[PDB]
């Protein structure tokens, strides 16, 4: 049975290079080209290039020309993808895929795929967060309900745990999943929905915990 098994997942800094591998088995290695496809987290598929496993001929995506190099090792049935001058825009899962032939007049579909390897381009090993209050829009005199919270900004790596009032407050608490920003750092928000009448009488403090940087922040959230 045709199998593509990839290796070379790695964590890198901006400006570095990375080389990943795609080991083919179960068919005649030189009878089929190999394509490379990457997927940034949460985004779609992006074709990178193709290589003739027999003679080493390649077709690269224009946006990668000069920066990428694909090779074949016929003695081991392995294809390799090297990508230089990495940015946080290169953080992605990198897939190899079997594609019989690709040329100037036709191209075959990708019938078998490797499992993907993650390459994480990050500008820091560890970085504590900046915590800012998300002050409630409603006022003590307002009625009904109020949403207030904390913005936990620009930390690395995941995760950040957030509680409220040292864990005494849990009803109406929603800590949202973090977003990976183009800077390579994470941001998240935690918001608690409380009775509007409690804004003048109850104290609200978010307890941010970022264990990787050994950082705790108890941030007081005051109505404006």
């Amino acid at each position: 049975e045709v199998q593509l098994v990839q290796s070379g997942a790695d964590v890198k800094k901006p400006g570095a290079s990375v080389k990943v591998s795609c080991k083919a088995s179960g068919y005649t290695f030189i009878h089929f080209g190999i394509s490379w496809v990457r997927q940034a987290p949460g985004q779609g598929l992006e074709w990178m290039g193709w290589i003739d496993t027999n003679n080493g001929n390649t077709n690269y995506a224009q946006s990668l020309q000069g920066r990428v190099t694909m090779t074949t090792d016929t003695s081991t049935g392995t294809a390799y993808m090297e990508l230089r001058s990495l940015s946080t825009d290169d953080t992605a899962v990198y897939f190899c895929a079997r594609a019989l032939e690709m040329g100037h007049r036709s191209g075959f579909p990708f019938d078998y795929w490797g499992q993907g390897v993650l390459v994480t381009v990050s500008p820091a090993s560890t970085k504590g967060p900046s915590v800012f209050p998300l002050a409630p829009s409603s006022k003590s005199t307002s009625g009904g309900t109020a949403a207030l919270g904390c913005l936990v900004k620009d930390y690395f790596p995941e995760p950040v745990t957030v509680s409220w009032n040292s864990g005494a407050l849990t009803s109406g608490v929603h800590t949202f999943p973090a977003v990976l920003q183009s800077s390579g750092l994470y941001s998240l928000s935690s918001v608690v929905t409380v009775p509007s009448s409690s804004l003048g009488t109850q104290t609200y403090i978010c307890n941010v915990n970022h264990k990787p940087s050994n950082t705790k922040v108890d941030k007081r959230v005051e109505p404006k």
């Binding site: 779609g44 077709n59 224009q62 579909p109």
Partner: protein, 213 residues
């Protein structure tokens, strides 16, 4: 380069027919292939050369291609067909051939009632501003199906730069949550009359607005 257009999402009740389109100028002159991708997995070829099923793909998957639109049809859809679907073509690229993928369509199989999103928008805090930074925080919760589109506007004009949006993930109550962030400088925040976060879900939009005042 040659561009492919797919809708971001399609919602379909179990047993109904799911229709995913792939638009391209005269795409009928090209061979279109379709890939299915479930989370944390690799894509799977499910339709090749417009309308051929590779071996092992259920007969309820079918495809057509004519004029400026290719179409993947999933008949009698089942829960396990919930996935992202990508179309793909080859193109000669003026002597520099390439493959292009569509942007992908999230196909949701409706296994729970529709739930309209709650949108909470926070302006930059005084503390963040007083530290030469500014973030608008758009929080989106309690919606289903788990697919939204977030658009930002400065005053009236769209803003794409500085925007980071999560992929919708399930909450404890089995609905979905997501957040979008607009990064800008204190001056651009101060320079405009207002900013808006617009959330599109199942054809309708909820838009919230904040202003430096």
């Amino acid at each position: 380069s040659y561009e492919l257009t797919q809708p971001p999402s399609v919602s379909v009740a179990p047993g109904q027919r799911a229709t995913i389109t792939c638009g391209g100028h005269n795409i009928g002159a090209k061979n279109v292939h379709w890939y299915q991708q479930k989370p944390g997995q690799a894509p799977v070829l499910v339709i090749q050369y417009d309308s051929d099923r590779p071996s092992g793909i259920p007969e309820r998957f079918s495809g057509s291609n004519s004029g400026s639109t290719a179409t993947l049809t999933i008949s009698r859809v089942e829960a396990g067909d919930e996935a992202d679907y990508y179309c793909q073509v080859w193109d000669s690229g003026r002597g520099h051939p390439l493959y292009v993928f569509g942007g992908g369509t999230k196909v949701t199989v409706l296994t729970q009632p529709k739930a309209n999103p709650t949108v909470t928008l926070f302006p930059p805090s005084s503390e963040e501003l007083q530290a030469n930074k500014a973030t608008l925080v758009c929080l989106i919760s309690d919606f289903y199906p788990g697919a939204v589109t977030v658009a930002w506007k400065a005053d009236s004009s769209p803003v794409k730069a500085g925007v980071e949006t999560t992929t919708p993930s399930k909450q404890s109550n089995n609905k979905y949550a997501a957040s979008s962030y607009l990064s800008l400088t204190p001056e651009q925040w101060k320079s405009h009359r207002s900013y808006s976060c617009q959330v599109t879900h199942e054809g309708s939009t909820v838009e919230k607005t904040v202003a430096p005042t």
